Design an enzyme around this catalytic site. Structure first.
Site, PDB file in Angstrom:
ATOM      1  N   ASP B  60      33.146  20.014  30.613  1.00 27.98           N
ATOM      2  CA  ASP B  60      33.833  20.856  29.658  1.00 27.98           C
ATOM      3  C   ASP B  60      35.174  20.740  29.260  1.00 27.98           C
ATOM      4  O   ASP B  60      35.895  20.630  30.312  1.00 27.98           O
ATOM      5  CB  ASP B  60      33.531  22.498  30.024  1.00 27.98           C
ATOM      6  N   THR B  93      35.585  23.919  22.845  1.00 28.06           N
ATOM      7  CA  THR B  93      36.766  24.056  23.463  1.00 28.06           C
ATOM      8  C   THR B  93      37.757  22.701  23.330  1.00 28.06           C
ATOM      9  O   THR B  93      39.028  22.584  23.112  1.00 28.06           O
ATOM     10  CB  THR B  93      36.639  24.363  24.604  1.00 28.06           C
ATOM     11  N   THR B  94      37.126  21.382  23.409  1.00 32.75           N
ATOM     12  CA  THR B  94      37.838  20.130  23.039  1.00 32.75           C
ATOM     13  C   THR B  94      37.981  19.857  21.502  1.00 32.75           C
ATOM     14  O   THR B  94      38.875  19.208  21.390  1.00 32.75           O
ATOM     15  CB  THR B  94      37.037  19.228  23.910  1.00 32.75           C
ATOM     16  N   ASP B 391      27.211  27.608  28.340  1.00 33.23           N
ATOM     17  CA  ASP B 391      27.533  27.227  26.690  1.00 33.23           C
ATOM     18  C   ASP B 391      26.208  27.343  26.016  1.00 33.23           C
ATOM     19  O   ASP B 391      26.228  27.879  24.682  1.00 33.23           O
ATOM     20  CB  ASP B 391      27.905  25.767  27.041  1.00 33.23           C
TER      21      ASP B 391
END
Ligand SMILES: Nc1ncnc2c1ncn2[C@@H]1O[C@H](COP(=O)(O)OP(=O)(O)O)[C@@H](O)[C@H]1O
Ligand SMILES: Nc1ncnc2c1ncn2[C@@H]1O[C@H](COP(=O)(O)OP(=O)(O)O)[C@@H](O)[C@H]1O
Ligand SMILES: Nc1ncnc2c1ncn2[C@@H]1O[C@H](COP(=O)(O)OP(=O)(O)O)[C@@H](O)[C@H]1O
Ligand SMILES: [Mg+2]
Ligand SMILES: [Mg+2]
Ligand SMILES: [Mg+2]
Ligand SMILES: [Mg+2]
Ligand SMILES: [Mg+2]
Lengths: 525, 526, 211, 538, 106, 49
Positions: B60, B93-94, B391
């Site tokens: 993550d 998030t990335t 997630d």
């Protein structure tokens, strides 16, 4: 490094460096734990900072007692800790299989292969291996002989041969004693008490309980033949009022009256106990034993001893249930309504004194559902080693009982699994056949390590065993005395099915996760 | 002596000009480069060493970013936007970090060419509005009643994680947990998985044995061994007040002058405990769970009525039990009512897992709380599995609240970029150049997917752009595992519209925030 | 810990598998560094000295001398490669790669309990057979200008840029054929190599005289 | 090329201060050398001719003695194999009471011979198996070597003769007097019931008059003084109270609430009258001696002095329990007068001054009682400590004799016979284990060799003569230390005998320690911490 | 002597063994006796000892002089202890005991 | 589990003060950045102005 431009005091390994670091740590751990595997393993000495001495060959104990500060070592240690917590065995095999998996994977990765293909091959090989293990397990009726064989296979690997032979009988008898039909086994009902006064072969099983405390009154009897056991959790010492009572008097006579009147609450409970004892046994032939989880003040001790009642105070909490199941009475948190039917029965109660420590024995119970193993040895480290060995044996026997299937040992199952994986390899598409081959070679480490520890050579013994298995189709393992192939089932070398399944699952998962790591970072400062 | 005279205090640094902008953009680019390789189904995992000695093996982006420490404030802003994206929608998030880094990288070009940052900001805001418009335009509806579609959505959400091996089981667990947590009261819809969807990790066993329970599971045991460890259909009474004898609030002091007052006080303490337990028993329950301690005398009085007692349970666990079994936590048992008695739990079992006792209240009928029991190799593996399940549950709740879907695997990025370029073709002012720049900077997601897959970036991107120049090719993405262009109507990789909207908004707004900034000042205290 | 550390407390000792692991790790590190040098498709390395001098090279020996290594096995391999360069003038990178791969393959079997002596015996037998095969496979021919041009190309292309290599091929072949006497050893001292720093790299040439 | 790096793997992962020793020459030989060094340190104190050692611990406390267990426990032993051997010696001391030096010497000899066997080519497992087989054979042989039995334990002369040998190694010059004292003290204890308790023998060390003036008292001696004025009682009627000799008070909280002047003027007078009534009620039972475990109030002391009651205060509750055992009284929890069964009786209680210290003596006249006390005189505290250690050895020997009455010859005769028989057995056993069995047999020679070395003669001549005589057929012949030249004599007549249980346990524990040390293959020592002792040791 | 990478006793342990240590013990006893020689007889003399606090003790008594001396030699403490024993049991001759013991050893 | 050891091989054999940069992102991009920085320093003095 990119992150080093943000946190200058950061240690980072990237790309092949992370793989090299992880594989080096795994290989170091495997090199340390190679000598542990098998009954022919070597004792290890563990000297703590304070000077304490331990003598163990357990994988988990050794992992916890080396002076290692490596991340991959920590991960493998946690995996082995979970293995020990759930199954109780296979930690050394866990570490060896993880290390050999990583080594075999690196053998192909260093030649330009991507780790993802290796992981896919590992997954396919693990699935096929689980299918083969399902196909190869031996379902059996867990009588005394099979449990004795499993206990031998564990304890002989853990301790000396004669001590292992004694511990086999002890563990099997205890497990058969505490086991109810079609009911999960509660290992909390087997108390492990250790004494430090006699030889290591004096360890035995007592069909009852051994308490590490005795009576606190000198006039109390040291031995009672026919005893009524009163398991209670009622305070028999002076208790202060919760609301700040205090006393107010105007003369010495009033002070004496208040002193005599402040003990009435505890005296009533003591009188209830004494009246019950008088009603139950009207002669001196029978006996009365009171085991209390809470304290007993000297006044109540004297009052009880005046009636010939043995009283033990500050007993352990688990001993409440242990005495309830062993003696057969019932633990009481209050004396509101106590009847002769709440008393357990013990066929012999006596006190044993050793140095400054006094022990109480409760034996000759009718049908004890809770028993104790009395570990005896001349040294503290001997006691610790025997405790570890009996824990492993109890776990092995409980696992054998839990599922009626048992797996042949001595590395035969590993050899058969590797052969089946090699046969199944063509069915795998793509380059995952390399991962399948690596998984098979990693599984083949157990017979290799067994032969190496036994003093023979790895290649010759392995090829002999594999040729025998291919020719006959049987489950041939490693004969640690001659090095020849040998049927594990016929001789009685058994392994736990759950242990093997856990080994496969955990080793494959952790190896896949480690192989996919491409960066190690320390930038939390 | 004669210390120097100063206007500002010492150790007060101050940079200004092009250097500040270049440093901010470089810090953002470095932050993006840290986790560039952790995007896509072929993403590799990273090991993070905590200052406390822990190890965080994760894929993550948010966890990786929050586990590191940085000094440059632009990097701090990047970490903050990553945390914001994680908290708002759950994933992406990335992707948002990569997008923000690329947008700042392409804005640096115009900053170096005598263009004021305000013009770039206005162009970026216009581009963001048109991105929102195009994303809403190319979305597709989804019926939440179709369980297969929901499972496919969750799978496409978790194909990039380490749980993709057991994707089917993971998707079923997440879907069941999210569905049963869903609750409505007083006309207010609520999906609160933070409190009422608990994940418990017990190392050992196999991950295939992990499941979601129709109830709750706590690490508790009976207070007394005589209490039953197995009740078929228990009536549950929940408490948050001690069953003991405690001092009052006011300063109360007794004064004893008679012989019988001490024993009378002790007897009244016992009688108060007995009356309290009688008030409990009047409702005839089967188990009693309390957040505070239970006295031994209270345990005896409860066992006299054949009642199992659990001594000390956390507030959150008690709330979960109340939701699951339909009970209502009360404090004064003299005010206990029949409605407060918790009926609905189909079994209460206390069995030993490994070397510890665990209490199961599973088999509930219509439970509004759940416990996801995770079993696995070790603590780190279970932590990563829990992150992936979080997630998945966040994606499930996002789809449930917003039933729109958009194509994944870079197809949405390419389609929006093409639409933005077509709209910019009609622009005549100076703002068109940064507009097109951010439009093509949106193409970083397929480029990163191709780079992580290991294929050839330039020719694949050129072919994908040529494909997207056609009429009905908005759903054409790229495989993250075979390095080929496919129509995602066939591959089936779809992501919630809310996630994409949040990602684009956060990236553009972070670009604006870091473009607005000049003349960094540091050193002052509070 | 050991005998030497008993006699000399401040002594460093690696014994049994430790010495083999240390040597193999050093050889593998050297091989990992010099892998990218092999072939014309190799990558330039820039080497900066303490004084700040910049050197661009792909030569195995030149790289080995300028690596910042303080390892004994690295020193041994460096000496072997230095001798290789001194006598033949080529094959340093191949030398290092072959040594590293030999050690790695030997360790692959040694870690399985096999003794190194058997591996060395196999190495000797294989070396004898390989020498026989090399004698069998060599291509004997009278070397005109074309073959020398081909050999010079095969070297210089692996050393420098293709166009510069093409120029240097003609230069070196013409120089060698100019100084060569019939049935006599070639004295390389009679070819002067002079440096001037005023033109492009492709302006280097051969002067049929002396500078 | 100037530094040797650490090998990749476990060598690099090791902590900064840790140490790892693996392999024969790095672990087993080092452990054997350490154990041999420990045995060498303790060897010189073996036997009657052993020499005392002044050992100073970390607290400037002198320990001059030849007790092996005491020397080992006062030595800061740091090597862990030596720690195993020390724990084996301590276990032997706890189980039996004598033979710690035998355990250490035998373990050291076994480990040196095991090192020799490993050097010549034998494997560790084969040596361990040979030692185990030889130990089993020795345990089988040992009962056949018993020469005589105690045959009585209520006799004074016979018990003294039996105990002389055990306390001849310590205090070699004067052991007959100590034997007589210990025999009398132990015969007073050990009633018709077979149970004998070591703790029933008390030792009081009073300085000044030389150890020749030591005596045995049928009672107890306390180095305290009487609280009251009465200092001598002839027909004591001791009443023992665990409560303080003071008016009882509430356990919750005491507060005198006065509301009128009459209460204020009467409270103290009434309290004093109550104290007087309680003391007189106690005295009316005939109790002329009162012993308390708590403080003594001034008013209570005054009223006790008024009624001629001797007051003794004992702070230690162990002393209170021992006094209750000695006199036959019961520790009352309240201040109530004692009933006829709870009031103990002693034939004489008085205050005396032995040397310098004032003592209170609860003296009986009959040659019986639950507890007997030995008063030890001397000119030095350390000398009295050594005599106390000798007394403990004698009492433990008596306890062992009560447990088992079988005896074996001392002076190295039993060890030589055991070595001969084990060698004879091993000469017939085929296989590689014969070497280990023969080495185990040879390890018994360390006892007569140590005795000869301490005595000051040639050990080889003594051993050769012992083998010659035992080959002739005399199993009860050993070293004669009363000669300037190597000589032997039969010691069944000399009375030099050892307990069978002592030898059995010593052999078993020494063999167990030796094989435990041999089993170890790898050493992993953590970095030594400077912590203020583990919390277990408090 | 050899380094012995794992030392047997704790570091700093001092050991003296054999005839030399016995001779040293005898010499220490002579040293202790010499400190109280001149106090014996009608022609004896007093000794003055000052402690750390500055207080001075003047005594002709052998036991007092020995006690005020801070003797730390293990063998020499025996003379002080026997002087204390003579003082306790008899009360006189606390110098004669030390002189006699030292002369025996000499 | 608090420190990352140096990778075995060349990383461990590197000298004390020496530095090693390999790959695109850490060598080529860094060199390009340095050259761009130098050009930026000298840029403002170009031409008659
Ligand atoms: N008597 C025996 N003969 C041959 N093989 C054995 C024998 N006993 C055990 N084994 C094999 O050796 C292995 C012993 O491993 P062990 O030391 O118990 O590691 P762990 O404690 O981690 O399980 C088992 O897997 C078993 O198959
Ligand atoms: N099978 C696939 N083929 C191509 N692209 C995929 C596939 N699965 C996921 N993706 C893409 O990868 C992205 C998810 O990567 P992930 O590591 O989860 O990043 P983030 O955490 O930012 O969502 C999504 O944008 C999706 O479009
Ligand atoms: N008078 C004696 N003559 C010869 N040997 C003796 C005599 N008395 C005791 N021994 C021997 O001395 C040994 C006792 O040694 P000792 O110093 O007591 O060691 P430990 O205290 O460990 O037993 C016995 O084995 C015994 O054989
Ligand atoms: Mg095992
Ligand atoms: Mg995602
Ligand atoms: Mg070349
Ligand atoms: Mg003795
Ligand atoms: Mg005088």
């Amino acid at each position: 490094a990119a992150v080093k431009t943000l946190n200058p005091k950061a240690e980072v390994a990237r790309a092949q460096a992370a793989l090299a670091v992880n594989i080096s740590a795994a290989r170091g751990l495997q090199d340390v734990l190679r000598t542990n595997l098998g009954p022919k393993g070597t004792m290890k000495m563990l000297v703590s900072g304070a000077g304490d001495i331990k003598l163990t060959k357990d994988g988990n104990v050794l992992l916890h007692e080396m002076q290692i500060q490596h991340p991959t070592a920590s991960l493998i240690a946690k995996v082995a800790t979970a293995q020990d917590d759930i199954t109780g065995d296979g930690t050394t095999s866990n570490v060896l299989i993880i290390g050999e998996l990583l080594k075999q994977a690196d053998l192909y990765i260093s030649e330009g292969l991507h780790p993802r293909i290796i992981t896919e091959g590992f997954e396919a090989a693990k699935e096929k291996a689980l299918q083969f293990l399902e196909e190869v397990k031996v379902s059996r009726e867990m009588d005394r002989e099979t449990l004795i064989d499993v206990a031998r296979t564990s304890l002989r690997t853990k301790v000396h041969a004669e001590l292992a032979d004694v511990l086999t009988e002890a563990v099997v008898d205890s497990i058969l004693a505490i086991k109810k039909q079609d009911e999960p086994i509660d290992l909390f009902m087997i108390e492990i008490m250790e004494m430090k006064h006699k030889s290591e072969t004096d360890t035995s099983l007592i069909r009852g309980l051994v308490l590490d405390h005795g009576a606190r009154h000198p006039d109390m009897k040291k031995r009672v033949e026919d005893a009524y056991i009163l398991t209670c959790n009622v305070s028999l010492e002076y208790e202060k009022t919760e609301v700040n009572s205090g006393f107010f008097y105007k003369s010495a006579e009033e002070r004496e009256k208040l002193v005599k009147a402040e003990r009435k609450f505890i005296e009533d409970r003591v009188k209830k106990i004494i009246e019950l004892k008088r009603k139950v046994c009207g002669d001196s032939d029978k006996g009365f034993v009171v085991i209390n989880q809470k304290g007993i003040d000297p006044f109540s001790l004297d009052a009880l001893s005046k009636e010939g009642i043995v009283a033990l105070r500050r007993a352990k909490r688990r001993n409440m249930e242990r005495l309830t199941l062993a003696c057969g009475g019932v633990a009481l948190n209050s004396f509101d309504d106590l009847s002769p039917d709440c008393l357990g029965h013990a066929g012999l109660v006596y006190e044993y004194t050793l140095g400054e420590e006094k022990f109480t024995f409760i034996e000759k119970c009718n049908n004890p559902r809770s028993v104790t193993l009395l570990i005896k040895g001349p040294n503290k480290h001997t006691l610790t080693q025997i405790k570890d060995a009996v824990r492993d044996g109890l776990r092995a026997v409980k696992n054998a009982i839990d599922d009626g299937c048992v797996v042949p040992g001595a590395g035969a199952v590993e050899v058969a699994m590797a052969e089946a994986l090699i046969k199944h390899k063509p069915s795998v598409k793509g380059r995952a056949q390399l991962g399948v081959q690596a998984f098979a070679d990693a599984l083949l480490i157990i017979p290799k390590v067994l032969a190496q520890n036994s003093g023979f050579d790895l290649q010759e013994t392995l090829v002999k065993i594999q040729a025998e298995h291919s020719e006959s189709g049987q489950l041939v393992g490693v004969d640690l005395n001659t090095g020849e192939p040998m049927v594990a089932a016929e001789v009685g070398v058994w392994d736990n099915y759950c242990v093997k399944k856990q080994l496969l699952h955990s080793c494959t998962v952790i190896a896949t996760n480690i192989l996919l790591v491409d960066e190690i970072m320390r930038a939390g400062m | 002596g004669h210390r120097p005279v100063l206007v500002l205090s010492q150790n007060t640094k101050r940079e200004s000009g092009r250097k500040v902008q270049s440093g901010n953009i470089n810090a953002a680019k470095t932050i993006a480069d840290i986790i560039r390789t952790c995007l896509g189904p072929k993403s590799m995992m990273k090991m993070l060493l905590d200052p406390m000695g822990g190890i965080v093996m994760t894929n993550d982006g948010n966890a990786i970013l929050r586990e590191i420490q940085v000094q440059h404030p632009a990097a701090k802003s990047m970490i903050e936007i990553s945390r914001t994206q994680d908290e708002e929608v759950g994933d992406g998030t990335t992707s948002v970090i990569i997008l923000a880094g690329e947008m700042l990288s392409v804005a640096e070009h115009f900053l170096e060419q005598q263009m004021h940052p305000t013009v770039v900001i206005s162009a970026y805001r216009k581009a963001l509005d048109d991105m929102i418009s195009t994303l809403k335009k190319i979305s597709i509806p989804v019926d939440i009643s179709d369980s297969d579609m929901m499972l496919n959505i969750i799978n496409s959400s978790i194909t990039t994680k380490a749980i993709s091996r057991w994707s089917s089981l993971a998707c079923n667990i997440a879907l069941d947990a999210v569905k049963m947590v869903q609750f409505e009261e007083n006309g207010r819809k609520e999906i609160d998985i933070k409190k009422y969807a608990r994940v418990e990790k017990i190392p050992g066993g196999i991950i295939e044995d992990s499941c979601v329970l129709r109830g709750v599971m706590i690490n508790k045991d009976v207070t007394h061994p005589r209490m039953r460890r197995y009740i078929k259909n228990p009536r549950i009474v929940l408490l948050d007040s001690s069953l003991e004898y405690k001092k009052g609030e006011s300063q109360t002091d007794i004064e004893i002058t008679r012989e019988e007052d001490f024993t009378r006080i002790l007897q009244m303490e016992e009688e108060y405990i007995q009356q309290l337990c009688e008030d409990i028993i009047q409702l005839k329950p089967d188990v009693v769970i309390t957040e505070k301690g239970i006295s031994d005398l209270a345990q005896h009085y409860l066992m006299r009525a054949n009642i199992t007692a659990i001594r000390r349970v956390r507030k959150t666990d008690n709330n979960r039990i109340a939701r699951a079994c339909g009970a209502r936590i009360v404090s004064r048992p003299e005010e206990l009512r029949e409605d407060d008695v918790g009926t609905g739990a189909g079994l209460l079992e206390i069995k030993k897992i490994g070397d510890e006792y665990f209490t199961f209240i599973t088999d509930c009928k219509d439970p509004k709380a759940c416990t996801i029991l995770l079993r696995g190799a070790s603590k780190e593996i279970l932590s990563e599995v829990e992150r992936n399940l979080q997630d998945a549950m966040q994606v499930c709740r996002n789809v449930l609240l917003d039933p729109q879907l958009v194509p994944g695997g870079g197809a949405s990025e390419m389609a929006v970029a093409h639409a933005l370029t077509e709209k910019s073709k009609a622009m005549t002012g100076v703002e068109q150049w940064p507009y097109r720049a951010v439009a093509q900077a949106l193409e970083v997601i397929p480029r990163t997917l191709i780079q992580n897959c290991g294929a050839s970036t330039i020719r694949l991107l050129t072919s994908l752009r040529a494909k997207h120049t056609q009429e009905n090719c908005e759903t054409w993405g790229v495989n993250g595992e075979t390095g080929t262009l496919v129509d995602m109507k066939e591959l089936g990789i779809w992501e919630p519209l809310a996630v994409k909207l949040q990602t684009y908004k956060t990236a553009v707004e972070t670009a604006v925030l870091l473009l607005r900034i000049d003349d960094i000042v540091s050193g002052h205290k509070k | 810990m050991a005998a030497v550390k008993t006699l000399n407390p401040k002594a460093e000792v690696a014994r049994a598998q430790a010495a083999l692991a240390v040597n193999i790790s050093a050889a593998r590190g050297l091989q990992d560094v010099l892998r990218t040098n092999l072939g014309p498709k190799g990558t330039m390395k820039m080497l900066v000295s303490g004084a700040g001098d910049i050197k661009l090279t792909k030569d195995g020996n030149v790289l080995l001398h300028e690596m910042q290594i303080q390892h004994p096995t690295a020193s041994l391999i460096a000496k072997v490669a230095t001798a290789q360069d001194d006598i033949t003038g080529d094959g340093t990178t191949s030398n290092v790669l072959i040594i590293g791969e030999l050690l790695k393959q030997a360790d692959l079997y040694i870690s399985e309990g096999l003794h190194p002596r058997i591996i060395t015996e196999g190495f000797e037998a294989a070396k004898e057979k390989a020498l026989q095969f090399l004698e069998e496979v060599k291509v004997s021919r009278e070397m005109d200008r074309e073959t020398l041009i081909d050999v010079a190309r095969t070297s210089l292309r692996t050393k420098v840029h293709a166009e510069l290599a093409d120029v240097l091929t003609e230069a070196v072949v013409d120089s060698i054929l100019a100084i060569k006497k019939q049935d006599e050893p070639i004295d390389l001292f009679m070819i002067e190599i002079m440096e001037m720093k005023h033109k492009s790299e492709t302006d280097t040439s051969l002067i049929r005289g002396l500078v | 090329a100037l530094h040797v790096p650490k090998a990749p793997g476990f060598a690099q992962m090791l902590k900064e201060g840790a140490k790892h020793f693996s392999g024969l020459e790095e672990a087993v030989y080092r452990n054997i050398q350490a154990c041999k060094e420990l045995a060498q340190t303790t060897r010189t104190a073996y036997g009657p001719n052993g020499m005392n050692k002044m050992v100073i611990n970390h607290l400037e406390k002198l320990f001059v003695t030849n007790d092996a267990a005491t020397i080992l426990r006062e030595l800061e032993v740091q090597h862990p194999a030596a720690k195993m051997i020390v724990m084996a010696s301590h276990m032997q001391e706890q189980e039996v009471g004598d033979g710690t030096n035998f355990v250490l010497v035998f373990a050291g000899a076994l480990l040196e011979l095991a090192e020799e066997l490993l050097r010549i080519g034998l494997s560790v497992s084969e040596v361990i198996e040979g030692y185990e087989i030889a130990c089993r054979k020795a345990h089988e042989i040992l009962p056949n070597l018993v020469c005589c039995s105690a045959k009585n334990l209520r006799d004074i002369d016979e018990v003294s003769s039996l105990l002389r040998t055990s306390i001849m190694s310590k205090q070699y010059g004067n052991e007959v007097f100590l034997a007589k004292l210990i025999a009398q003290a132990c015969v007073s204890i050990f009633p018709d019931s077979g149970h004998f308790n070591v703790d029933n023998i008390r030792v009081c060390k009073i300085l000044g008059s030389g150890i020749s003036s030591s005596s045995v008292l049928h009672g107890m001696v306390f180095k305290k003084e009487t609280e009251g004025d009465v200092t001598s009682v002839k027909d004591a009627k001791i009443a023992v109270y665990s409560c303080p000799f003071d008016g009882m008070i509430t356990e919750t909280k005491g507060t005198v609430l006065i509301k009128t002047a009459e209460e204020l003027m009467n409270f103290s007078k009434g309290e004093e009258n109550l104290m007087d009534a309680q003391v007189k009620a106690i005295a009316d039972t005939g109790a002329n001696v009162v012993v308390t475990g708590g403080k003594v109030a001034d008013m209570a002391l005054h009223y006790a002095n008024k009624y001629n009651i001797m007051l003794v205060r004992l702070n230690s509750k162990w002393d209170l329990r021992r006094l209750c055992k000695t006199v036959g009284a019961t520790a009352l929890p309240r201040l109530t007068p004692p009933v006829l069964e709870e009031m103990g009786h002693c034939d004489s209680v008085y205050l005396s001054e032995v040397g310098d210290t004032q003592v209170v003596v609860f003296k009986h006249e009959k040659e019986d009682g639950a507890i007997s006390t030995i008063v030890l005189r001397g000119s030095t505290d350390n000398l009295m400590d050594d005599i106390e250690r000798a007394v403990d050895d004698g009492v433990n020997t008596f306890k062992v004799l009560t447990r088992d009455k079988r005896l074996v010859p001392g002076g190295g005769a039993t060890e030589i016979e055991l070595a001969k028989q084990i060698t004879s057995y091993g000469e017939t056993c085929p296989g590689l284990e014969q070497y280990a069995i023969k080495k185990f047999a040879e390890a018994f020679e360390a006892i007569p060799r140590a005795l000869a070395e301490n005595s000051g003669v040639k050990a080889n001549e003594v051993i050769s003569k012992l083998y010659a005589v035992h080959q002739e057929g005399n199993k009860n012949v050993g070293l004669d230390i009363e000669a300037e030249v190597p000589a032997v004599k039969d010691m069944l007549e000399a009375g030099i005998l050892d307990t069978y249980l002592g030898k059995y346990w010593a052999i078993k524990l020494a063999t167990n320690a030796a094989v435990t040390v041999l089993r170890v293959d790898q050493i992993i020592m953590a970095k030594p911490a400077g912590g203020p002792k583990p919390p277990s040791g408090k | 002597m050899m380094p012995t990478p794992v030392i047997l006793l704790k570091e700093g342990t001092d050991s003296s063994q054999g005839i030399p240590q016995l001779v040293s013990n005898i010499s220490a006893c002579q040293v202790i006796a010499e400190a109280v020689r001149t106090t014996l007889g009608p022609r004896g003399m007093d000794k003055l000892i000052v402690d750390g606090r500055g207080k001075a003790t003047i005594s002709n008594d052998g036991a007092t002089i020995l006690k005020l001396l801070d003797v730390v030699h293990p063998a020499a403490k025996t003379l002080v202890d026997i002087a204390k024993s003579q003082d306790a049991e008899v009360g006189d001759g606390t110098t004669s005991v030390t002189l006699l013991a030292a002369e025996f050893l000499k």
